[PDB]
Amino acid sequence: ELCPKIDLPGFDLISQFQVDKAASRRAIQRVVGSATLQVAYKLGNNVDFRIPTRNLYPSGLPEEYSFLTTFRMTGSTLKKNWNIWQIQDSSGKEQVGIKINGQTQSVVFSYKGLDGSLQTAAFSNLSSLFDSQWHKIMIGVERSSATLFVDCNRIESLPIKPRGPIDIDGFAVLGKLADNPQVSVPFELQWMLIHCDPLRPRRETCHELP
């Protein structure tokens, strides 16, 4: 449904979560991004960006897709474990998500397996991502693998098990602390996209990361 066979469509999450609107309504601050002409949005601070899961993924996520985002974090945020994006059930339990694990300087892709357990693909050794500068991370979710790209460089590919159904009675939310779904973490957001083409990250360039 979200991604029909056939180029393949993509979804602008900054648009869907109405981040731009919130900035145009003085809810959050807009700042210069990774490059002079780029606009970024400052987050965290107790703005709640969440959308009922049923409103976006009534049938869950497709088998294959890619998640791409350009963001910046600094100070205390660098040591926190937080989900830049995730789908959680009504109680706040993660169904699928992309976690920036500052405690181990790694990025973790979590997903529900066929038996309902939460499986993970942990990409470690990513110290370069925690330097307070702008970075772009992309994850290509394929049939049996998940591949991480950082600043347009292929970093590593890990095997992943078949995805099971997810609970859709919750919400898709942005920048929430890994342990507490009610706590937002401050960070700057410049781009966030979910694309139907799992190989979408391969044709991305990073000229905007001076």
Give the binding range for Zn ion (CB under 5 A) out of 52-60, 64-72, 90-98, 142-150: 90-98
Q: Which is nearer to Zn ion, 74 or 90 (CB)?
A: 90
Q: Give yes or no for residue 20 binding Zn ion (CB under 5 A).
A: no
Q: Give yes or no for residue 89 binding Zn ion (CB under 5 A).
A: yes
Q: Give yes or no for residue 167 binding Zn ion (CB under 5 A).
A: yes
Q: Give yes or no for residue 92 binding Zn ion (CB under 5 A).
A: no
Cα separation, 204 vs 152, whole angstroms: 7
CB 124 within 8 A of CB 174: no
Cα separation, 202 vs 83, whole angstroms: 23
> Least distance to Zn ion from the beta carbon of 189, Å?
28
> Least distance to Zn ion from the beta carbon of 91, Å?
7
Cα separation, 38 vs 162, whole angstroms: 38
> Least distance to Zn ion from the beta carbon of 96, Å?
14
Q: Give yes or no for residue 169 binding Zn ion (CB under 5 A).
A: yes
Helices (H) and strands (E) in the chain, counts: 3, 14
Which backbone phi and psi does 46 adopt, to 5 degrees? 70, 50
Residue numbers at the binding site for Zn ion (CB under 5 A):
89-90, 167, 169
